Amino acid sequence: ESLEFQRWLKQRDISFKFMPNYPWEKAKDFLELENSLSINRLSISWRIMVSNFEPAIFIQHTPTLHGVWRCKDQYSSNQFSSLKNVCQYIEHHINSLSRRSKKT
Amino acid sequence: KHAQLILEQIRKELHPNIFSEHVGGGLKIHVFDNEIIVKVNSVTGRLVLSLSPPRHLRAAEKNIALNTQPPAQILNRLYFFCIQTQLLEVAQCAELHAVQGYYSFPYLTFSKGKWWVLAYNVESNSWSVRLLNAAGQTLYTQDV
Amino acid sequence: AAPEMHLIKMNKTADLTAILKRILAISRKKXXXXXXXXXXXXXXXXXXXXXX
Amino acid sequence: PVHGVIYYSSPSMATFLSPAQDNLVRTYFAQHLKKWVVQYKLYRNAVTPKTLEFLKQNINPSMLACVDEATMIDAEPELEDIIVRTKLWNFRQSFTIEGSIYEVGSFKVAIANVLQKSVWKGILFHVTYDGTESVDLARPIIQEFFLKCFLQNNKSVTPVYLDSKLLLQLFKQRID
Amino acid sequence: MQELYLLGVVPSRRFEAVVNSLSKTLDGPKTILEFWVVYRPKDVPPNLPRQPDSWLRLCSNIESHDETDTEWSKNTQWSMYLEGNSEPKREDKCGIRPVNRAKLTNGSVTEFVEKMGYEFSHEYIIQGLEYFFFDTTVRIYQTLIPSQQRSIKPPFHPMNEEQPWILHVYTHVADASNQVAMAKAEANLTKVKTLLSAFCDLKNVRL
Amino acid sequence: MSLEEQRTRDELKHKLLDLNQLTICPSLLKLLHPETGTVNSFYTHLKSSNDTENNETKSINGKSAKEPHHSEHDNDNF
């Protein structure tokens, strides 16, 4: 999925950042990997970037296995189903964010 | 034989709009098209979303664990609901809140942000701008 | 009111009008491209269409 | 994050006027006073009283105020009722708070019809809002939306500060 | 909560050897450490419920707590119990005692029973071992008397330091109205009794 | 000359005054003078702490808190 995002932006070379924070990075003993593979929510923020002076539309992303694409800008946070929804949302940016930036 | 008889069972208990096929119970909560199967042996039917499914299968199938209240119009619940979530994602930009208080119909209210009132309705989807109160003067289109 | 065959009165943007748009008096004509010298003419062709 | 529940002399309309508002909705907001009286005397008042109300903050903690009026311990049971039922304890005309909290935006409005054992008491209203501001930088301005939708025949009672504080604040209306 | 249970002494001399016949074949071992206060509601008038269960039993589990740490008395987890008595005519049969398993959350803890005014009485500490079988479990006993009232510091005071291991298979029914968990759990734990019978002799005792 | 851009930051300082309607901040206006030496209502909805910033051609960071006013190094001004 994250590969689909990254390939999606390799398409257009916009700057963005995969940001892992894995439980399995941690293991003070062999029994902590036992807890390191829990289904629990896992943040993976992304940082799409072409705009300069303005701060990135920082993203919350916790693809829990069950029981997961909510970005935030300077306007409003928004859950997205498909990553494609993120893509097209930033296309709403590639037009309207560009225009609104032009009006500023 | 009993299985495809169930496949035609729900299919003829179902609506024409959603073509259930023998390819694999292709339930068609558009945009998505997804599997309908009953489990071999012990039940909890193997109906499946097309990648990772959330609670939908879990809900219909734990409902199968409930056994009571056969699922057909309930599948229609799945249809209208998953579509609800879809449109909610479509409701994000242009905050068409679709608050349901002004009428509780299955037809389901569509609304607007921020807001004497001038109503907003679509269904098929069909772009019937039915502004109403009562019933204000309206205008209609069938694009897309 | 109206009054006159003049139409637009216009707003953005692209659409397949049927509601519709570019109304002269009351009823829409969907002639977004109509000239000020030809908007009333569009309402005249619309008048030709007004038979039913 | 100031609290501000308000009692009203003009009920019913909350079920009617709030939906009439063109805006958005959330979930339940119901809570229950439960007066107590020990089957014998002795334990009459204060620290060792007939007085008691487990307080049903149903909305969040799901934890009763195991409180003999200003006796601060809390627990879900219920089982404690039966524990209290060792040839002991009765009730008195408590008035439950039930309703209707709804999503709005910058602020959100808790709503609840209020119910004496004599059926009715009188609806309470509340509006949660951002707490970084001092008490009245916008609280009256929030109350502009207590006048939008317009609200009528309000009681003077003013409990004041998340919402756990409302528990003690229940007493502010309970002692009435 | 209708606990179903039996009793059987284990001399300490054979204890851990029994544990080898237990824990290797069971869940656990889990050492127990829980400070009791069985406060007695001295009350008027008769007929008082007066039964041992009728007296209150605040139940502070503290097994993970330090033996000298000071925050315990009203910060470490507490509980409370009256519990119904085990059934009449429960001969040899596992005793069935309904239970109110109380829980609590405040810096004030003990206080409410004295807010109920109840007097202090006898005190001890469950300190045995427990071995799971789903909802059912066995709970072999150690109940040392604490060295001082509201003092968590060992040595404590078993009636003999040649302390009996009051082995105690059990389960906890949600509600006694159905026959289901009755015969079911009685059967499972009777089979558990067959397991202990390979090394012990449990019995019912009136309660 | 270019101070009009800083005046927008001063207008942002006026927005802080607008926040006052909702001292050292004047010294921050003096920092805007140091800069001279060298819609958003939705952002308020985000504040309804949050984030915001200036642009073209200075990245003052008007992130809501009080509020940030950092120039753009990070220049963590408030």
Side-chain angles (χ1 to χ4, degrees), chain A, chain B, chain C residues 1-3 14 18 25 31-52, chain D, chain E, chain F residues 26 34 37 62 65 68:
Chain A
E1 186 178 6
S2 61
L3 174 62
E4 184 273 335
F5 183 85
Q6 297 181 338
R7 291 182 294 103
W8 177 254
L9 294 180
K10 290 176 180 177
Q11 186 176 357
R12 53 189 60 81
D13 292 345
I14 295 172
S15 178
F16 67 94
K17 301 294 184 292
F18 178 77
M19 287 179 278
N21 57 345
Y22 304 141
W24 54 84
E25 301 301 325
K26 180 182 170 62
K28 302 296 177 63
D29 61 352
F30 300 154
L31 274 65
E32 289 182 354
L33 176 58
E34 179 181 1
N35 293 337
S36 298
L37 298 175
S38 62
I39 67 101
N40 61 346
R41 59 186 67 85
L42 177 63
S43 63
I44 298 102
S45 296
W46 293 96
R47 186 170 295 105
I48 60 101
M49 286 297 293
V50 177
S51 178
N52 299 132
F53 298 96
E54 294 303 321
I57 296 171
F58 297 103
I59 297 170
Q60 183 63 259
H61 173 57
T62 58
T64 304
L65 175 59
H66 51 72
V68 306
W69 288 100
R70 189 174 181 82
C71 301
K72 177 179 288 295
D73 57 355
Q74 64 177 19
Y75 300 139
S76 179
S77 182
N78 293 282
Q79 290 183 337
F80 295 153
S81 65
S82 65
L83 192 153
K84 293 177 296 298
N85 293 339
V86 175
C87 299
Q88 61 180 15
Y89 173 70
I90 305 303
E91 292 177 350
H92 294 293
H93 291 80
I94 199 169
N95 190 31
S96 65
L97 176 65
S98 178
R99 295 181 182 175
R100 295 179 183 275
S101 63
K102 290 174 180 177
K103 293 177 179 177
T104 57
Chain B
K1 292 178 178 178
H2 179 63
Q4 290 181 335
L5 287 175
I6 296 170
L7 294 176
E8 299 304 322
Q9 183 178 358
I10 299 171
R11 183 183 298 176
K12 294 184 174 72
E13 292 174 350
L14 187 80
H15 288 279
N17 297 284
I18 303 98
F19 296 99
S20 80
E21 295 177 352
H22 290 290
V23 176
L27 68 85
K28 295 175 180 178
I29 300 171
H30 302 292
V31 178
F32 288 94
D33 290 343
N34 292 331
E35 297 178 351
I36 292 170
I37 300 169
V38 175
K39 180 173 171 290
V40 175
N41 298 338
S42 63
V43 192
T44 59
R46 287 177 289 104
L47 50 86
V48 172
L49 302 178
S50 65
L51 174 62
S52 63
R55 189 180 300 277
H56 306 296
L57 303 179
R58 309 295 180 271
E61 293 169 350
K62 190 173 182 179
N63 186 30
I64 296 169
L66 175 62
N67 284 332
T68 60
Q69 295 179 336
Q73 295 177 336
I74 298 170
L75 275 66
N76 297 337
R77 294 179 177 275
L78 301 175
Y79 180 75
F80 288 160
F81 174 77
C82 295
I83 291 171
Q84 280 177 333
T85 60
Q86 292 173 335
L87 297 176
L88 290 172
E89 295 177 350
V90 179
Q92 303 305 319
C93 292
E95 295 178 353
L96 303 178
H97 304 292
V99 177
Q100 294 81 359
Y102 288 140
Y103 62 86
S104 61
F105 292 95
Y107 179 86
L108 294 176
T109 68
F110 295 163
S111 66
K112 175 179 174 291
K114 297 175 180 177
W115 59 275
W116 51 275
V117 175
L118 295 177
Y120 172 78
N121 290 333
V122 180
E123 185 67 13
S124 297
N125 279 336
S126 177
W127 301 100
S128 64
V129 177
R130 296 180 183 175
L131 64 88
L132 62 83
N133 291 280
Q137 297 173 336
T138 59
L139 55 79
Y140 301 137
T141 56
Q142 295 178 337
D143 291 344
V144 177
Chain D
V2 177
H3 294 293
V5 177
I6 298 105
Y7 186 82
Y8 288 89
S9 176
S10 178
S12 66
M13 296 305 297
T15 304
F16 302 154
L17 178 62
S18 62
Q21 180 60 62
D22 294 344
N23 289 282
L24 198 144
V25 170
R26 196 177 73 86
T27 67
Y28 295 141
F29 181 75
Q31 293 177 336
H32 308 285
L33 297 179
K34 293 182 299 299
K35 294 176 182 179
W36 283 87
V37 173
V38 177
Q39 289 182 337
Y40 61 79
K41 293 181 297 297
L42 295 176
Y43 301 137
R44 298 177 185 172
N45 61 346
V47 175
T48 60
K50 291 175 180 177
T51 65
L52 168 64
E53 286 186 345
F54 293 166
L55 298 177
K56 294 176 180 175
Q57 288 179 331
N58 297 336
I59 295 98
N60 291 336
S62 66
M63 302 303 291
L64 304 175
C66 301
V67 176
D68 287 344
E69 292 178 350
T71 61
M72 299 302 293
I73 291 173
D74 292 342
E76 295 177 350
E78 295 176 351
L79 295 174
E80 291 176 349
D81 286 343
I82 296 171
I83 294 171
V84 169
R85 290 175 184 172
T86 177
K87 273 69 180 181
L88 286 176
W89 288 86
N90 293 337
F91 289 162
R92 183 181 291 180
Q93 184 175 354
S94 63
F95 52 94
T96 63
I97 301 168
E98 320 164 332
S100 175
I101 183 167
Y102 299 142
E103 292 172 349
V104 176
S106 63
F107 60 93
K108 290 177 179 178
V109 54
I111 295 170
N113 290 281
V114 181
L115 300 173
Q116 288 182 334
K117 291 178 178 176
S118 62
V119 179
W120 182 255
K121 179 65 178 295
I123 297 170
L124 297 173
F125 282 158
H126 187 276
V127 175
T128 58
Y129 181 77
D130 290 346
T132 58
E133 291 183 352
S134 66
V135 175
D136 287 341
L137 290 177
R139 186 178 68 83
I141 297 171
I142 299 298
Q143 294 173 333
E144 295 175 351
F145 294 159
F146 277 98
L147 296 177
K148 182 178 177 181
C149 295
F150 62 92
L151 301 173
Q152 296 177 337
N153 289 337
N154 53 33
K155 183 60 166 61
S156 62
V157 175
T158 60
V160 175
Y161 181 79
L162 298 176
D163 288 341
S164 64
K165 272 68 181 179
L166 290 167
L167 190 63
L168 290 174
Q169 299 177 342
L170 299 176
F171 297 94
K172 297 174 182 176
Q173 295 172 335
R174 165 59 180 84
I175 296 170
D176 295 344
Chain E
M1 179 175 72
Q2 298 82 0
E3 184 177 4
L4 276 65
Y5 65 94
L6 294 176
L7 295 173
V9 67
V10 174
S12 179
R13 57 171 296 278
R14 60 186 297 274
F15 163 70
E16 187 174 3
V18 173
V19 176
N20 188 32
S21 177
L22 290 173
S23 296
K24 302 304 287 186
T25 59
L26 295 175
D27 291 345
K30 54 178 291 181
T31 60
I32 306 303
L33 175 62
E34 170 272 332
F35 174 78
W36 289 83
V37 283
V38 183
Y39 298 141
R40 60 183 181 87
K42 185 177 180 180
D43 286 341
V44 65
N47 193 341
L48 274 69
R50 72 181 183 88
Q51 292 297 100
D53 63 351
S54 64
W55 312 107
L56 270 71
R57 288 179 171 83
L58 296 177
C59 183
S60 179
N61 188 339
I62 56 173
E63 197 281 337
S64 63
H65 185 273
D66 180 67
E67 63 186 344
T68 59
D69 177 68
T70 60
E71 71 179 342
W72 60 281
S73 62
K74 291 173 180 174
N75 295 132
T76 304
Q77 181 59 59
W78 278 88
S79 295
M80 177 176 67
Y81 295 91
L82 288 182
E83 299 177 350
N85 294 131
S86 64
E87 291 181 351
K89 293 177 179 177
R90 193 64 179 164
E91 309 86 355
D92 289 343
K93 302 166 184 176
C94 53
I96 299 173
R97 53 176 179 183
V99 173
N100 289 284
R101 186 174 181 82
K103 293 183 174 73
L104 53 84
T105 303
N106 192 335
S108 178
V109 173
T110 298
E111 299 177 352
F112 191 82
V113 301
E114 294 86 1
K115 295 173 182 177
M116 294 183 285
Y118 301 147
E119 291 176 347
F120 174 77
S121 179
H122 63 283
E123 61 185 341
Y124 64 96
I125 290 170
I126 307 302
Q127 194 171 355
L129 293 172
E130 298 178 353
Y131 307 130
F132 298 156
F133 179 77
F134 298 94
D135 189 5
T136 65
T137 298
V138 58
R139 181 177 60 248
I140 183 168
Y141 291 145
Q142 295 291 100
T143 56
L144 282 70
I145 307 304
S147 64
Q148 291 292 99
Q149 183 175 353
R150 290 297 177 91
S151 178
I152 58 173
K153 296 183 175 74
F156 304 102
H157 305 296
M159 293 298 293
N160 293 132
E161 292 179 349
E162 290 300 322
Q163 185 173 353
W165 292 89
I166 310 304
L167 197 148
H168 177 279
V169 178
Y170 73 89
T171 188
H172 293 288
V173 177
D175 179 66
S177 179
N178 291 132
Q179 299 83 357
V180 179
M182 295 298 294
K184 185 176 181 179
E186 288 176 353
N188 290 282
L189 297 179
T190 301
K191 268 65 181 179
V192 173
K193 183 173 178 291
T194 62
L195 190 147
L196 64 83
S197 64
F199 51 86
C200 187
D201 289 341
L202 268 66
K203 66 180 182 298
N204 188 344
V205 177
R206 185 175 179 83
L207 184 145

